[PDB]
Amino acid sequence: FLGLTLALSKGRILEETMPLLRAAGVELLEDPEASRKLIFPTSNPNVRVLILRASDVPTYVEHGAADFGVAGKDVLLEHGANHVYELLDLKIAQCKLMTAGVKDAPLPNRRLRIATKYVNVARAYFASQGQQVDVIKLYGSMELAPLVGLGDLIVDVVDTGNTLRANGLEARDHICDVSSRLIVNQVSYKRKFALLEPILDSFKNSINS
Amino acid sequence: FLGLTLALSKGRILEETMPLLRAAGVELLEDPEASRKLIFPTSNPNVRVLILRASDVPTYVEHGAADFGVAGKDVLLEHGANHVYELLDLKIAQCKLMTAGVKDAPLPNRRLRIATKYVNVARAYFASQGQQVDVIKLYGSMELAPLVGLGDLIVDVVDTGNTLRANGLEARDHICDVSSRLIVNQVSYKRKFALLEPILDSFKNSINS
Ligand SMILES: N=c1c2ncn([C@@H]3O[C@H](COP(=O)(O)OP(=O)(O)OP(=O)(O)O)[C@@H](O)[C@H]3O)c2ncn1[C@@H]1O[C@H](COP(=O)(O)O)[C@@H](O)[C@H]1O
Ligand SMILES: N=c1c2ncn([C@@H]3O[C@H](COP(=O)(O)OP(=O)(O)OP(=O)(O)O)[C@@H](O)[C@H]3O)c2ncn1[C@@H]1O[C@H](COP(=O)(O)O)[C@@H](O)[C@H]1O
Ligand SMILES: [Mg+2]
Ligand SMILES: [Mg+2]
């Protein structure tokens, strides 16, 4: 396949990327949410789409199994973005990386235990606050961890805050704002630039308005 | 909560554990699949259930946020089971850890790249075959990796083989048989044995037939 392969994740990133793609002359021919298929053609015969877990987008792009992709800044920070080029902030799937714990719970006077998927981000954030922390790596449902005493705080993405509030948790600290970024393979950028450039320019134009 | 906290995952493990629980006098009061809730009471007031990602069951059990749980041998091998007690093979959610690649694809003559969630299992298996391999850590959809050239083989769980066959892949090697196991926290076993013992005996009886 000589064309471009675009890596996306289902749900938020796919929903909010599709208008950008449509403006660029690229439309999916079916709904990937309703399929077991993983490779999808588009209305442009030079572009196909891989549907991945969000955590795997940078990996496929890094290794060149996709030429480019859309990934959340939270994922890029955690995975490490040293072997891809971040080209555009698409301003989509907006949220915050935050810390949170049980509402009005005092912090214990000892080395903190942080339950989180974002172990690198958690360590780096707490390092900036002067704390060397223990991390408990989890893969989902971070909001449960404080309720059953697994760790003293969590680090997770927060949008509306409804998940925190539903579970008797409150956000303690804002770490950083998060949005989805367009990343490119470092070799694809050099070899397939003529194919990438119109789509990059289209996206850039669309995000201005 | 002085009673027992049982860690389970949704889908396969929950479906096949429920009959074991029912025989032991423990029934959920609603369907966790249809809820955002994560802590669930049962018909026994001394037992509650946490609903977790499969990868997190050993972690909650290890740290004592759950007293016991049901986890697949594939997860236990990958996570490491040195800080829990494996008490019973429940013979449920049966499958195999296998290697697979594109059907009739020759292996390249160089260090192999293995795309997988099971990075420790992949390294240990290939070590037994005399190969020091590179691993590409993924979080899902392993069946895609060989189709887009991300790695030369995968390591994944296989049940019917339909996923492999649908994607033009075939299993190369059988690594080991996999089934779900009852794991217990090493302190809970010592302190809550009177509560655990009847349920352990019930499960053991049920799996004999
Ligand atoms: N609210 C978000 C959210 N908002 C924006 N995003 C971005 O969307 C990207 C892709 O979302 P995914 O669902 O693929 O990512 P994910 O849910 O973190 O991971 P998966 O377990 O679903 O694979 C993420 O990597 C983020 O950059 C969010 N990602 C996750 N959430 C979750 O939704 C819940 C919080 O929502 P509020 O209750 O509105 O705060 C929490 O569980 C959050 O973790
Ligand atoms: N077929 C199974 C399967 N059979 C049994 N099990 C066991 O069930 C346990 C719990 O299943 P989960 O769905 O929670 O685990 P998971 O799907 O590996 O992980 P999640 O991404 O869903 O969190 C696993 O840890 C295994 O021990 C299986 N776990 C996963 N699969 C998947 O189903 C597909 C293959 O099915 P066949 O096409 O029938 O081979 C592949 O994607 C497999 O990875
Ligand atoms: Mg999600
Ligand atoms: Mg599954």
B138 and A56: CB-CB below 8 Å? Answer: yes
Cα B71 to Cα B166: distance, rounded to the nearest angstrom: 27
Domain span at A33: 1-94+177-209
B139 and A55: CB-CB below 8 Å? Answer: yes
Cβ-Cβ contacts under 8 Å, B150 against chain A = 59-60, 63, 65
A144 and B53: CB-CB below 8 Å? Answer: no
Cβ-Cβ contacts under 8 Å, B147 against chain A = 38-39
The answer on B103 and B130 residing in a single domain is: yes
* CA neighbor of A181 nearest in space, from A105, A77, A100: A77
Instruction: Name the residue with tokens 């000892």.
Output: A110
The answer on A121 and A146 residing in a single domain is: yes
Cα A77 to Cα A85: distance, rounded to the nearest angstrom: 13
- Alpha-carbon Rg for chain A, nearest whole angstrom, is 19
The answer on A143 and A203 residing in a single domain is: no
Provide the experimental method for this PDB entry: X-ray
The answer on A124 and A157 residing in a single domain is: yes
Adjacent-strand bridge partners of A102: A169
Instruction: Name the residue with tokens 């996709």.
Output: A66
Instruction: Kindly tell me the sign of the dihedral angle through the C-alpha atoms of B25, B26, B27, B33.
Output: negative
Helix (H) or strand (E) holding B128: helix B119-128
Tell me which residues of chain A, numbers 10 to 39, contact chain B at a CB-CB cutoff of 8 Å: 36, 38-39
Please give the residue of chain B at the shortest CA–CA distance from A64. Answer: B150
The DSSP letter of residue B167 is T
CB–CB of B17/B200 below 8 Å? no
Data resolution in angstroms: 2.0
Report the SS3 class of residue B118. coil
The answer on A8 and A86 residing in a single domain is: yes
Cα A119 to Cα A115: distance, rounded to the nearest angstrom: 8
The answer on A186 and A87 residing in a single domain is: yes
Report the SS3 class of residue B15. helix
Phi, psi of A31 (to 5 degrees): -85, 110
* CA neighbor of B171 nearest in space, from B113, B109, B114, B96: B96
CATH value at residue B167? 3.40.190.10
Q: Give every CB contact of residue A202 below 8 A, 6+ residues apart in sequence.
A: A20, A23, A24, A25
Distance from CA of B61 to the nearest CA of A (A): 10
Count other Cβ atoms within 10 Å, centred on residue B106.
8
The answer on B171 and B109 residing in a single domain is: yes
The answer on A181 and A90 residing in a single domain is: yes
Helix (H) or strand (E) holding B93: strand B84-102
Q: Which two tokens stand for residue B40?
A: 């669930």
Q: How many structural domains compose chain B?
A: 2
The answer on A183 and A165 residing in a single domain is: no
CA distances from B152 to B100, B101, B133, B145 (A): 9, 7, 11, 8
Cα A166 to Cα A169: distance, rounded to the nearest angstrom: 8
For chain A, the DSSP string reads --SEEEEEETTHHHHHHHHHHHHTT--BSS-GGG-S--EEEBSSTTEEEEEE-GGGHHHHHHHTSSSEEEEEHHHHHHH--TTEEEEEEEEEEEEEEEEEEETTPPPPSS--EEEES-HHHHHHHHHHTT---EEEE-SS-GGGGGGGTSSSEEEEEESSSHHHHHTTEEEEEEEEEEEEEEEEETTHHHHSHHHHHHHHHHHHHHHH-
CA distances from A33 to A10, A39, B152 (A): 7, 12, 28
CA distances from B86 to A168, B55, B118, B119, B204 (A): 34, 16, 20, 22, 13
The answer on B183 and B124 residing in a single domain is: no
Cα B43 to Cα B22: distance, rounded to the nearest angstrom: 9
* CA neighbor of A156 nearest in space, from A81, A80, A75, A90: A75
Q: Which two tokens stand for residue A26?
A: 């690229």
The answer on B158 and B59 residing in a single domain is: no
The answer on A58 and A1 residing in a single domain is: yes
CB–CB of A97/A178 below 8 Å? yes
Instruction: Kindly tell me the sign of the dihedral angle through the C-alpha atoms of A66, A68, A69, A74.
Output: positive
* CA neighbor of A142 nearest in space, from B12, B80, B140, B56: B56
For B18-55, the DSSP string reads HHHHHHTT--BSS-GGG-S--EEEBSSTTEEEEEE-GG
